Structure formats: C-alpha cells, structure tokens
Design an enzyme around this catalytic site. Structure first.
Site, PDB file in Angstrom:
ATOM      1  CB  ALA A 141      -0.948   0.012   1.191  1.00 11.39           C
ATOM      2  CD  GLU A 162     -14.865 -11.776  34.807  1.00 11.85           C
ATOM      3  OE1 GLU A 162     -14.204 -11.112  35.638  1.00 11.85           O
ATOM      4  OE2 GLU A 162     -14.916 -13.028  34.824  1.00 11.85           O
TER       5      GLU A 162
END
Ligand SMILES: Nc1nc2c(ncn2[C@@H]2O[C@H](COP(=O)(O)CP(=O)(O)OP(=O)(O)O)[C@@H](O)[C@H]2O)c(=O)[nH]1
Ligand SMILES: Nc1nc2c(ncn2[C@@H]2O[C@H](COP(=O)(O)CP(=O)(O)OP(=O)(O)O)[C@@H](O)[C@H]2O)c(=O)[nH]1
Ligand SMILES: Nc1nc2c(ncn2[C@@H]2O[C@H](COP(=O)(O)OP(=O)(O)OP(=O)(O)O)[C@@H](O)[C@H]2O)c(=O)[nH]1
Ligand SMILES: Nc1nc2c(ncn2[C@@H]2O[C@H](COP(=O)(O)OP(=O)(O)OP(=O)(O)O)[C@@H](O)[C@H]2O)c(=O)[nH]1
Ligand SMILES: [Mg+2]
Ligand SMILES: [Mg+2]
Ligand SMILES: [Mg+2]
Ligand SMILES: [Mg+2]
Lengths: 427, 31, 430, 427, 430, 31
Positions: free
Chosen positions: C90, C245
C-alpha cells in the site's frame, strides 16, 4: 423429616459451598465416596436432613451447583469431596456473566434457570418433608447475584410456605476487587429484601480481620476464610442434625429473631477462635465462649455493633454444658450492655443447645445478631452506587442487556427505605 | 431522598459451524 | 472452547505476531513443527495426531515479510492458506490499503477467517495486530474491521496498535494514516491498546540495560502483554478475568475504549538478583510514568479505571494491600465518578521467558490496563502534526489519485477533535 | 399355548428384529446354536411362545425374515445369532424396492408375498394355539412399508380373530434420511389404521434424544437405538413368557388401552435408563421407575404428552415389587397430573407385574401410552406430504408402478380423518 | 449379481474409462493381467481360474486411442473383442458419427454388448462415457443410446458427459455437436451427469496446488465420482443406495434428470495434514460453488434434490447434524415443493487412492449429486453460442454433406429452448 | 379439508441369458 435443600450459585457460592459440604460430611461421618464410616448412631439418625440415600450404603448431598461458567464446576468436581455430588445436580452455562447482574438476572441466567428449577423440583419431590432452602453466593458479581436472585424469586413462587435462607457475601470498599460491585449489590439487596426469610451478611473484610487479628494467620487464603463461613453455616442447623437439651431449628430461630418482616439481615459470629500458640493459655468454659461471641471483633460483618442496637440475638451452643450457666451468662451480657439492646423487646437473647460438639472441640458457639448497625454496610454501598449512578458510569452495559435506568432508581430507593426502617427501630 | 443524574454530553447474526453442530446434540428439547 | 482468533496485518502486525506465536508455543510446550510431546486449545486447533495449528491469519499486501515466515523456523506451524500475501504493498498510503489494493485481497482473507471461525465452538473474539502509520496497517485494517463488524456483529474485537511517536517517526505521511485509521477504529473496535515505540526503546535502555534495542526487542515485550491478557483464558488461578468481564470493568463509555498497558517488572538477569520484587513494589511501579508503553504524562491526567492482571506466586491479600497503598498516593488521581477503579485478576502461572530474551525470569509479574485521560495528549500532538501538513495540502494529491476524497480527511480530523473533547469532559469533576 | 408369530420386513425391520431375537434368547437361556443352557425351569416353561422345538435339544425362533434385497438376509445370517433362524424362513427377492411403496405393495412385493404367506401358514399350523402376530418394520421406505402393509392385509384376511401387532419406525423431519418418506408413511399409515389391532410408534429422533440426553452416549449407533426398541418389545410379552402376581397378555392390554377401534397407536417407553457414571447415584425402587416412565423425555415417539391427554396408559413392571406401592404410585401420578388424563375414563392406568426381571436389573418397567398428542406426529407427516403432492413431485415413479393419484388423495383424507378423531377425544 | 456394464465412446470416453478401470482394479485387488492373488463381480466377469474381465466395451471410430490400450499396461485386462475400432473418425461432425461412419460399426458394438449382457444375471444398467463436442462422442453415442433404448427398454442408462466450457473450448464446431446430442440425450437417458473441464482445472490448481493439470489429472478425479456412485453396489455399509433408488430420490420429473456432481475433500498430501476434515466440514464444502464440476452459480439457482454419498469412517448422527446445518444456511435455497431434499448414503470403505495420484488419502469422503436449476445457465450460454454461428449458417454445409438436414438443427434448438423453459418453471415458488 | 393439485406445465422386453437359465431352475412351479 425436615430436609434442607442446598443451592450454590457463582464462584464464591460454589467454593464456600464445597467447604460447607466437606465439613458437614466429616461431622456426619461421610467419606469422599459417600459411605458412612462414623462411630456413633447419632451421626446417621438425622443424615436425611442434608443427604439422600443412594443404592449400596451411600449418601449424596441434596445440593444443586449452579454457574454460568463450567470452570467452577470442573474445580469442584476435581476437589477433595468433588465425587460425592450427584452429576445431574451440576447445572452450568458456557459463557459467564462478566460481573453483570443484568446478564445473570435477565439474559444468560434466564436461559439457564429452567434447568435449575427442574433439578430443584426433583430434589424437593425426593424429600419427605422439605423445611426449606439455603443459598450460598455473593451480591457483587453477576451469576451469584443476578442469577441467584432470579432463582430465589422462582423458588419462593413455587414454595411460598417454606423457609428461604441465604449466606450472602457482601462487597466491602477496603477489599474492593471489582468496579460495578455497588450496582450488583444494590440490585440484589432489593430483591433479597422481599424474597428471603433470613440472610446471613458475610463480609470478606471482617473475615480477613478475624484471620489476621484473632487467628494470628500470617497468610490467610480464601479457603481459610471460607472455613469460617462453613462453621457458621453448620452452627445454625446443628439442632436439626443432632439431639439436645433445648432445640431450635431454622423456623424457631427466625420467629425469635425477626420482629418485623423486613428486618432479617444477620451479623453472624462463631466462637471459639484461637491461634495455635495461644491455645494452651485458655479456659474451655461457657463464660469464655459467651465473652468471645458478643465481641465486635468476632462478628463476620464489617459493622460496629456499638454503633447501633441489637434487636435480637440468637446463640446456639454445642457441647455438654450447664443450662444454668448459659442462662446466667446471657442475662449478665444484657444487663451489663443494656445500652446496646433495644428496650422494648425484653430478654433480647434466645438460647439453643445441642449436645454434640463439632470435631476437635468440647464446646462451641454460633451467634446470630440482628443489629441496627447493619445499616452501615448498606449505607456505604448506597454511597458508592450514587457516586457512579450520578454520572451514569458503566450503565450502558446493563442497558445492553435490556435493563432501564428506572430499575436502578427503584433499587436505590428500596435500599434507602430499608436503611431508614432500621434507623427507625434503632432510635 | 433519591439520586438525580446529570450526564455529561459525549459525541454519540453469525454462529460458528462447530457450535451449531454441538447445539444440534446438547440442546435440550422443550418436551 | 473459549477460542481467540489472531489477525496479523502488515509488516508490524506480522512481526509482533511472530513473537507472540513463539511465546505461545513455549507456554504450551508446542514445538515449531506443531507437535507437543487442554487450555492450549484457546490458541490452537488440533488435527489428527501430534499436530497443533495456530488460530491465526497473517496478511500483508506485499510478499517479503510473510515470505520469511514461509521459509523460516515456524514454516510447519502454520498451514500455507493462513499466510495471505498480495503482490504490491500500500506504499504508506491509506487509500491504497482501504480501496485500490485492499479490495483485491479482503474477500479472500474474510473467507479464510470464516473457515477458521467455523472450527471454533466458543469464539471469545479477535486480536488484531497492526500499525497505525502504514498504508496496509491503516487502510487495510480499517476495511477488514468494517467487514468483520458487519459479518460477526456483537463479537468483541481487540486491536493492538503501534501508534506513532512524538519525535521518533520513521515515515513522513504517518499523521495522515494515523488520523484516517482512528476514525474507523472508533466505531468498529471494542477496545484498543495503543503502544509507542519510543517509550519501549526508553524502557529497554533504562530498565533492561540494552545499549541498542531493535524491533525484535520491542515485539517480545509486546507479546508478553498479550500473554498476560489471555493467560486468564489459557490457564486458571484464584481470580479470573474473561474478555467480556475486562470490557465491562475497563470501559466506562462506548467511545472511551483506549486503555494504556504497562508491564512490571522489566529487569535484567543481573539487576534483578539484588531487587526484592514484591507485589506491592511491582504494583507501585505500574503507576509510574517511566514504565509506560505510550509517551505521555499520567500525572497530568486522571484515572477512570485500572485492571491489574497478576501472574505467578501471588495471593489476594497482598494485592489488596497494594491497591490500598496506591489509593493513598496523592500523585495518582482517579475521577470522582469512580469510587473504586480496580478490577483485579490473579493467575497461578509465572511468566515464561523466551530463550535468548532480554527479560529475567521472575516469580511474579503484572500487566496493568488503565484508562487515563492522559492518552489524549498523544492525539493532540498527532492532530497538530496533521494540521500543519494539511494547511499546505502536502502529499494530499497521492491519496486523491487512489480514490480518496479531501472531505474524508476533514471528516476524520473532526471526529478526532470530537473524541478529544469527549475525553476532556469525562475528566472534569463536579 | 399362546404362540406368537414374528415377522420382519425390510432392512430396519430385520435389524431391530435381530436385536429382539438376541435379547429374547439371552432371556430364555438360549445360546447362538439354539441349545438351552439356562439355570431356571421358568426359562423353559413358556419357551414355546417364541420358539419351536427341533430335534436334539434345540429351539428355533418362530420368525419369518422378509426383504426385497438379499443383502439384508446375508447380514442377518452372518450376525451373532444368525444361525439360530430356520433357513426356510428367509424369504427374499433379488431387486429391492428403491424407497417406493408402490413397488413393495403392488409390484415386486406382490410377486414375493405368496412365498411369505406359505411360510407363515406353516408356522401357524406348527403352533398349537397362535394368539397372533408381531411385525417389525418402517413406514418410510418401500419394502417394510409397502410389502409389510400388504403382508398384514393378507394375514388379517386369513386370521381375522387373531391379535395383529406392529412395531413401526416412523419418519421424522429432523432425522429425515429420504425424500419420498411422507408418501410412503401416508400410504402405509392408512392401511395400518384398518388392519392392525395395536401399533407401537417408534421414532428414530426420540431414540437419538434418549441416547444422547438420558444414556449420555457420545456416539449412539443404530444398534444402540435398536436395543431400546428390543427392550420395549420384550416388555410387552413378559406376562406371556413368565409367571407373575398380576398378568396381562397382548389381548388384555389392548382391551384396556383401546376404547375405540381406530385409536391403537401407542407411544412406548422403557424404564430405567441411566448412564454408566450416573448409575451409582440412584435408588433401585418403584417410585423412581414410575417417575422415569411418565416423563416426556423417556417416550420413544417425538411428541410432547403435555400437548395432549392420555386416553389410557398400561404399565408393565418386572421384578419383585410391592403391589401396594405400585398402586399408590400409579394413583399419585393420575391425581397430580389430572389435567393430562381424559376425565371420562376413570383410573386411566392399567398395571401388570411379572416376577422375573430382565438380566442385569432387579427391576424394570415398560410403559404403553395412548395419548392424543400422537396427532402431532401424523400432522407433520401430512404437511410434508401436502408440500410434495400439491406439485405432484416424484409422483410419476409411483404411477409407473400402476398407482393412481386418487389413492394418494384417499390416503391423505384417511390420515386427516384419523387426526380429527384423536382431536375429538382430546377435547 | 448386480452387474453394471460400462461403455466408453470416443477419445474422451476411452481416456476416462482407462482411469476408471485403473481405479476399479486397485479397489478390488485385480492386477493389470486380470489375476487376483465377491463384490468385484459388479464390474468383472470371472473366467476359469485367476482371471477377471471388465464388464466393459470400448468404442472409437479411429484406432489411435484404443491402440494405446492394446499395446499398453492393461492389454491383458480386456479381451480383444471388447475393444472396437473403425478406420476413419467422425472428424468433429455429429452427422458422420450418427449416420455416415457410425452406421458401419453400430451393429457390431450392439452384438458385443448383448453378448456381454447375457453373461450377467442381475443387470442394474449401463454407464456411458463420452464427450458432447466430438463427432463420435455426440453422433455415435446418440445412435448407440437409441438402439440400446430400443433393445433393452426399461434398463437404466446413466451417461457421464464432458460438457463444453464457456471459455476454454478446444474445437470450433462444439456448440453444434453439443446441441445435437442433447436432443437425443433428453429422451433416451435416465440420468446425465454433466462435467466441465475448466471447472476441473480450477479445482486442480486451487485445491490440489497443481501448476499445470493435464487430462490425466481430470480423468482420475472423474473416476473417483463414478466409484462413489457404484461403491454402494461394490461394497456394503450402514446406509445403502441402489441405482433405481438414486433415480427415485434425485429425479423429480422425467426430463429433469441432470444432477451436478461434486466431490469432497480434494486436497494435497501436505495441505491435508493441517486441515481437520470433519463430516460437517466436507458436507459444507459440497454446497460451495468453487468445488463444482460445472462452471455456474448455484447461489443464483435453487436445489430440488441432493443425494449425499459418504464413504469411509462416517456415522449417521453426524451426517444428520451436517444436513441440519446446511438447512439453516440462507445462501443455499431449496424449492418449496421439496420439504426434505436429502437422500443420504453411507458406505464403510474409505476412498482408495491411485499410486502417483494428485489426491491425498483421507479417512472420509463424499460425493454430492444435486439437481439445481443453476445448470440451465450452461445451456443458455451454449445456446447463445449456437445461435450466433447458425445466424450465418457457418459450417452447416459439412453436416448437410453427410446426410443431416437443416431442419434437424432447428428442431434441436427448439427442444433445448423448451427444456430451459421447463427448468425455469420448476424453479418458481407459489 | 383435502389437498388440491396445480401442476406446472412441462414439455411432455429383453432378458439376460444367464438370468433366464437361473430362472429355469430357481423358479418355483405353481403346484
Ligand atoms: N469469602 C470468599 N470470597 C470470595 C471467594 N471467591 C470470590 N470471592 C469474592 O467475591 C467477589 C467475586 O465474586 P464471584 O467470583 O463469585 C462473581 P460470580 O462468579 O458469582 O459471577 P461472575 O460475575 O459471572 O463471575 C469478590 O469480592 C471476591 O473477592 C471465596 O471463595 N470466599
Ligand atoms: N431405529 C432404526 N432405524 C433404522 C434402522 N435402519 C434404518 N433405519 C431408518 O429407516 C429408514 C430407512 O428404512 P429402510 O432401510 O428400512 C427401507 P426398506 O429397506 O424397508 O425398503 P427399501 O425401500 O427396499 O430399502 C430411515 O429413516 C433409516 O434412517 C435401524 O436399524 N434402526
Ligand atoms: N514495534 C514495532 N513497530 C514496527 C515494526 N515494524 C514496523 N514498525 C512501525 O510501523 C510503522 C510502519 O508501518 P509498517 O507496518 O511497516 O507498514 P505496512 O503496514 O506494511 O504498510 P505499507 O508497507 O505502507 O503497505 C512505523 O511506525 C514503524 O516504526 C516492528 O517490528 N515492531
Ligand atoms: N476431461 C477430458 N476431456 C477430454 C479428454 N479428451 C478430450 N476431451 C474433450 O472432449 C472434447 C473433444 O472430443 P473428443 O472425445 O476428443 O472427440 P471424439 O469423441 O473422439 O470425436 P471425433 O474425434 O470428432 O470423432 C473436447 O471438449 C475435449 O476437451 C480427456 O481425456 N479428458
Ligand atoms: Mg465466575
Ligand atoms: Mg509493508
Ligand atoms: Mg433395503
Ligand atoms: Mg477422436
């Protein structure tokens, strides 16, 4: 004949439960396989109160093990005494509740609970005359608190005439291990107020203090803490399990200790408690036990009894003792400490005596006090709840499980009302 | 008496195949 | 059950991932060929007999970094189809990552992920490793995250990101990429652990006595943090923390999901012998600015929540004591809307150490994950950097060439401004 | 003295049949050669009910094995117990029926059936007083369903005063292994309605559920499933084969369980059923057996009994038991579950007791329930049939065997009428 | 008993047949000389002592392909009179195959077939292998099929056909031949399995990691499918499917007898080790478009019936689970007039693998035969191709020269149009 | 009450010698 049905919900509930079972099996002469290897006929006489008799000279706990996580179950099964439990009595989820009362009460727990209900119905059917239920858990997490409360509600709906007892470990700010504890406690406390007949307020902080200060224990573990709780639990139901000179079961205790329906939150205590070094410099006598029991440092709730008044105390004595001596010592305590006892309930003290002492000791005592000072515990919790709720911190999670803000408002109100009521009778 | 909330102003399904298979067996029917 | 799927994107992601997989193998006793002469199942699928395969996908738009993995020591650990490589990178261009080049490979990677996920029966979620600055690490990851969010929905996504430094920046266009990825990160990620190379370098020099720390040194350290996070799933101890959690405890508001991670103790073999590394000590060291993984000043910020994850020879009581001590320290301030800001995990297994590693073997370690307002400072500097370059439209043409629109940049900047403002707000007392 | 003639048609029928024979030989102390090697005189007393006595201390099943394929026959002959069967009692075609009811009923089966008829006539002649016939098969295929039905019709024509019993494995949509099942089932059900006196509705789905949920069996096989069916089959005819305290044969059961001629479709159950691990934590007692038997999860048909009403239940107990206890437990079940029993048949429960328990167990129970909830099974099938028939899908094959559309219309109508009738009495 | 007679027509038919016979020999332990140091009787006659002869006839109008067989490794397997060869081929001309050249050899082949059939005591039917595109594979096969239909009548005929590709077409006149053979195929064939070389090539490259797959690679794969079909006759397991049974299940209407075959798993020795190829997985892979033997999109079609034929270490319960899973997958749609569209076969024998083959040895395999409307797309493209060429009457003169009439072409096209329309109709919901 | 069919509109002996021989023996006569 007066069977008790035991329920364990969430990690803490399970672990304390396991300890309880271990002690009780030892007491009744039951080994890790379920076989009776005791000496005395008294050990088997009332074995049916806690155990179902299976084929081939074996006994199985009338116990239901509940959790949203299977790890706890595994831990239990792998423990010493793990194999005594009925395999079909383990009712477990796979996900967990993530310290969320809403997940335990409305969502995951809801899905889970029907299995549990099915099990407990069967367990009730098995018993000839079930006197009621004992639930061990905590109020600060998600499973024990949310799922546990839900289960309680369900149970009471189906057994409205049975005795509903809980051993509830409350969150303290000193030993604060979680963030949302205030929320979970608040929500659960409310539910407990309407649906339990007696609630033993167990505090981790107090346990630690006992271990460090009284037992002189350099490094207490949760196991050690659990042991204390187990002892207390055993104490209450000694009158159901053995003979005695004056006998009081769960109902008799409640009737004598609860003058108004809501005021059923006990501060438990157990005596004697000594270090290994300091054991030789003591007197094995009733006055000493009495002295120990009424002390603030021996209460398992982080409340100063001198900051309130006793509505009632129930004292349960185990061992061969003089009734006269017991009566004198109990009258002395009320006369000398007049100012800590409400004046409109004469003879604030109820006494019960079981002839069979626990193992290792010739005499023991279990104390159940209904003190207006328990408001301190609730007040702190309320304050913490407010601190969070004012900013709606962490609420989004609960709302994601279907909960509304209004429920929070309700619970908080309810708890406040309870606190007010206690204050009223304190005067 | 009761709490009053003033909130600060901020800026505003798939199932695994194995799991499904498992459910097919270990799911309890209504009965 | 309880599986976690790891996705390693671009060079940085790949290299961190290598370290991570080295560490996991050592922890579970899995050899580099997949053989093990149980809990390991959280990270590994098991096939047939004497074979374990990582629950991981490695992606890069260029072949070079992945090619190393194929040739190298752990070539037998991964099956070839889990190592996905394009032809052209990229080129430090978000647009190329998200659109022009990324659109050619994204479908394939998604398919593979789906295949992987179908094999797991209790999916906890995803661990996504990537840089903020690279065109692949930004553009591709952003795209991937969107797709994952769409397909899977309510699954937890945790991203570990190499956020760019204030001073020590290796590329020119980094601020652009960072800003662009952040926008997408906000909506599609449930928790994001930012990490800063400069801070890691300082730690290596100061705490480990390393003259010249290289990327291999950083990566190893980073992997340890991940291990601490996932040890609660891969082992069991006295007090346990699941991912859900953790999220519940650590994240007070949906957008405020940027905890800072810090690890203790980080010491040399010789330096450690003399130190008496107690629970209290290590806990105290956690809340000190010098041991932070991101360059910034907590003394100038406020804590909203901290998770403390202990591992090894640790008992609750002493953790409690440590927490109490921390409470009484005036220089560590917590917001008034959090009366207790401590989630605590304790696991029995001591940290295992990689042969030839920089860290000494300790009886106890800790990973603190804390949500502090102080991290907003990083965003401020990055924003400032962005604003200068954009003032001149420097390099913008490149992005436009690959299909990006100028309006997107502005949008992204606005989003970050809003986020900073949100962070400011939560800070203030009433 | 009350001989039963056994017929096995098609693959499923054959395989279940084999299992049945294996269990029964074990029960009666017969080994794989046909020789009696049992202990008790009770094992030989009524051996003639299921076995013909051949020359030289050998016993041979009064069994006819029928299939359009010889592979099944080969499999049977090669099995453990394969050599006990009379070689002349294997009646097989060469072609197969290709899951086509028409081929089994009108074409290939038609050609085959006369041989079968010849065999069964001889088998009837051999027996001194044949009480009737037991046919094992499935309704979803071609042979068992089409050929089987045809055979039944033929039998009833020649023996209109004898008891005609079937153990029919029905196709379920969950465990749907074939495409034309709805057609085959529909066509066969109709025929069964007019020509069988009692039909045990066996469902593969239910069997799987039993195996997985109750028996805790990770990988059940068809053999395991078959075993359950075999047990049930054995249960029904225990009263014909052994002594007892209260005895009910096939006729007595039918008369007590079938209040109207058409309503003879039973949901069978067998108790007890336990896992290997969970066997030690149980009570070998009558209340437990009773509890197990009336449970919905222990019924071998995929119907919820709580979705209908029981017209009648027949319970057959094996082992040394107290009659009083049995009577109390059966009255308790009807009083407590009043709403699941039709109110116009007082004492919906019939009890029979055989002193000889099955091997390995001290007590066992077999349950036969005539529930209006069986309509669910038929309804699903009907729906599936409709889905296909509306578009005339796969009809051409059936028509190629000489069948007309009109037959389909008739069968469907008949089944619907049956369903309606059940609903009527349900109320 | 239960014999099946195999007829191999033209080059393609011969070459597929070679592979098939290699595979059968290996499966039954028959050596290339006919000796075997039972069920094999379904494919082989047995003569005297230590000799087994394939129940097969090989026909081509040219000698070259058959001559290889005569010279080659399996020269002793077949008796010379079962290998029938003319002098001049049909030169990609249907007319030459059906009329001019075919009329010289057809009688002879029929006689031999009759002789072969007289030796078999439980004839199940015929397996006919040929291409759609060649003059012999089309014209001769069509003729042969007619004659067989006349002589034998109600015997089942199953034809395995190499249908021409959309792109990868080797001859110019293919569409003409394909159209002409299809017309006859409709009336005289009971079930036809179309196969596409392009699809096979893709599979070989993608799933088997073969850079350059040749016809030998295709043929081997094709043979496996045939083996799966006939394993229910040549062995025995838990659940069995005869040919008539198969027909009953898979064919809802007389003309709609074109199931697509797909095989799973097709994997390399090294690639397979890592994969955990479960029953559920392989079943799932069956219903994916990438593993299809014909190029076309099932996602754009609807399923009417699928037969799943499992082989090896497989139990019913898990097959049921797989089926259930498939049911719940929204992207796989079944017509509303089929509430259950699954016929299931399970056989105990694992697939045996040819020494030097491309496929790895697996514990379980599956062959899915599914009647989907999606195959109509192939016909559409072929029809389009036909229509262009016919617009100009391109090549038509050749056909006319060999006795074909122009009206036949039109007739054939019409027939195919009608068939496509029929397929459309069955699709639509009410 | 009863199903009603609406059908969509679509487009509209030898014996082996060995088998025969076998039949000659294993065929049961009428008798
Ligand atoms: N006295 C004891 N306290 C405990 C014990 N285990 C946990 N705890 C305390 O209870 C709180 C944690 O509660 P739990 O693990 O029981 C929460 P639970 O598993 O019930 O629900 P989840 O939210 O699904 O985890 C916390 O205050 C712990 O410090 C124990 O064995 N004894
Ligand atoms: N409970 C059992 N179900 C079986 C058994 N064998 C088959 N089946 C089920 O029955 C159905 C298949 O029936 P069959 O093989 O009996 C058909 P049959 O051979 O009687 O006639 P054909 O049409 O000639 O094959 C299907 O639902 C199977 O899944 C068995 O041993 N036990
Ligand atoms: N901690 C750490 N950071 C790295 C490593 N490799 C690269 N970086 C950092 O990552 C950023 C550069 O991004 P890369 O990951 O190399 O780029 P990419 O994702 O491959 O993107 P393109 O090459 O532009 O397609 C810089 O901030 C580097 O300092 C590594 O091994 N460890
Ligand atoms: N799968 C496969 N296809 C083949 C093979 N050989 C030829 N083909 C295909 O078959 C078609 C050509 O037909 P052939 O079978 O060679 O021609 P023929 O039947 O001998 O007819 P004529 O030579 O015209 O008499 C083309 O589509 C080829 O791609 C083979 O070994 N395998
Ligand atoms: Mg827990
Ligand atoms: Mg790169
Ligand atoms: Mg059959
Ligand atoms: Mg040729």
């Amino acid at each position: 004949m007066r069977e008790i049905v035991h329920i364990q919900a969430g990690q803490c509930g399970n672990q304390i439960g396991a300890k309880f079972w271990e002690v009780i099996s030892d007491e009744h002469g039951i080994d890790p396989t379920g076989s009776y290897h005791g000496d005395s006929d008294l050990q088997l006489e009332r074995i049916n109160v806690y155990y179902n008799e299976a084929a081939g000279n074996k006994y199985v706990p009338r116990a239901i093990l509940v959790d949203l996580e299977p790890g706890t179950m595994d831990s239990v099964r792998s423990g010493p005494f793990g194999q005594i439990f009925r395999p079909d009595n383990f009712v477990f989820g796979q996900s967990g509740a993530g310290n969320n009362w809403a997940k335990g009460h409305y969502t995951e727990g809801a899905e889970l609970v029907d299995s549990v209900l099915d099990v407990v119905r069967k367990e009730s059917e098995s018993c000839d005359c079930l006197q009621g239920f004992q639930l061990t858990h905590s109020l600060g997490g998600g499973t024990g608190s949310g799922m546990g409360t839900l289960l309680i509600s369900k149970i009471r709906e189906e057994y409205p005439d049975r005795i509903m007892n809980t051993f509830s470990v409350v969150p303290s700010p000193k030993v604060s291990d979680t963030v949302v504890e205030p929320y979970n406690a608040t929500l659960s406390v409310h539910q407990l107020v309407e649906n339990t007949d007696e609630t033993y307020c167990i505090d981790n902080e107090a346990l630690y203090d006992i271990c460090f200060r009284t037992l002189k224990l350099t490094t207490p573990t949760y196991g050690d803490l659990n042991h204390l709780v187990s002892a207390t639990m055993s104490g209450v139901t000694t009158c159901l399990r053995f003979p005695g000179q004056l006998n009081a079961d769960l109902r008799k205790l409640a009737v004598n200790m609860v003058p108004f329906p809501r005021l059923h939150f006990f501060m438990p205590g157990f005596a004697p408690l000594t270090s290994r070094g300091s054991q030789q410099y003591r007197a094995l006598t009733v006055p000493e036990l009495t002295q120990q029991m009424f002390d603030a440092k021996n209460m398992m709730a982080a409340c100063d009894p001198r900051h309130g008044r006793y509505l009632t105390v129930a004292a349960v004595f185990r061992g061969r003792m003089s009734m006269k001596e017991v009566d004198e010592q109990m009258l002395n305590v009320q006369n000398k400490n007049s100012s800590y006892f409400v004046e409109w309930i004469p003879n604030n003290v109820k006494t019960a005596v079981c002839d069979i002492p626990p193992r290792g000791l010739k005499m023991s005592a279990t104390f159940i006090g209904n003190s207006t000072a328990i408001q301190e515990l609730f007040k702190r919790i309320s304050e913490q709840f407010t601190a969070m709720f004012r900013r709606k911190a962490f609420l989004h999670w609960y709302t994601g499980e279907g909960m509304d803000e209004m429920e929070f408002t309700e619970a908080e109100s309810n708890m406040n009302d309870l606190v007010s009521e206690y204050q009223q009778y304190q005067d | 008496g009761c709490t009053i909330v003033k909130p600060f102003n901020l800026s505003q399904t798939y199932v695994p195949l194995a799991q499904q298979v498992e459910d097919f067996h270990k799911r309890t029917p209504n009965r | 059950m309880r599986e976690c799927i790891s996705i390693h994107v671009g060079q940085a992601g790949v290299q961190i991932g290598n370290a991570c997989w080295e560490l996991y193998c050592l922890e579970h006793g899995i050899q580099p060929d997949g053989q093990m002469p149980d809990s390991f199942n959280t990270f590994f699928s098991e096939t047939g007999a004497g074979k374990h395969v990582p629950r991981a996908v490695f992606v890069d738009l260029e072949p070079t970094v992945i090619d190393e993995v194929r040739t190298g020591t752990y070539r037998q650990l991964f099956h070839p189809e889990q190592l996905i490589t394009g032809k052209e990178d990229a080129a430090n261009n978000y647009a190329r990552g998200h659109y022009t080049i990324g659109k050619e490979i994204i479908d394939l990677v998604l398919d593979r992920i789906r295949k992987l996920a179908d094999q797991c029966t209790g999916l906890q979620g995803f661990l996504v490793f990537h840089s903020f600055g690279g065109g692949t690490g930004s553009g591709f990851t952003s795209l991937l995250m969107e797709r994952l969010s769409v397909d899977y929905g309510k699954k937890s996504k945790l991203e570990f990101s190499i956020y760019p430094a204030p001073q020590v920046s290796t590329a020119v266009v980094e601020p652009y990429n960072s800003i662009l990825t952040t926008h997408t990160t906000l909506e599609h990620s449930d928790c994001a652990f930012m990490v800063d190379n400069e801070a890691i370098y300082d730690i290596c020099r100061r705490n480990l006595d390393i003259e010249r720390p290289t990327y291999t040194n950083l990566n190893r350290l980073i992997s340890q943090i991940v291990s601490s996070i996932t040890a609660s799933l891969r082992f069991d101890g006295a007090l346990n923390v699941d991912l859900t959690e953790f999220q519940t405890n650590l994240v007070p508001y949906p957008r405020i999901h940027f905890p800072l991670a810090t690890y203790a103790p980080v010491i040399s073999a010789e330096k450690a012998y003399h130190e008496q590394l107690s629970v209290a000590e290590i806990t105290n060291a956690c809340f000190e600015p010098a041991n932070q993984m991101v360059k910034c000043d907590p003394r100038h910020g406020k804590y909203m929540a901290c998770c403390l994850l202990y591992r090894g020879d640790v008992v609750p009581k002493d953790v409690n004591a440590a927490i109490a001590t921390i409470k009484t320290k005036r220089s560590i301030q917590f917001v008034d809307w959090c009366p207790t800001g401590f989630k605590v995990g304790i696991n029995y297994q001591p940290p295992t150490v990689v042969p030839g590693g920089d860290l000494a073997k300790v009886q106890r370690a800790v990973c603190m994950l804390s949500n502090t307002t102080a991290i907003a400072e990083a965003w401020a500097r990055l924003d400032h950097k962005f604003d200068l370059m954009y003032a001149k439209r420097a390099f913008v043409h490149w992005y436009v060439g690959e299909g990006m629109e100028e309006g997107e940049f502005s949008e992204a900047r606005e989003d970050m401004a809003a986020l900073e403002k949100d962070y400011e707000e939560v800070g203030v007392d009433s």
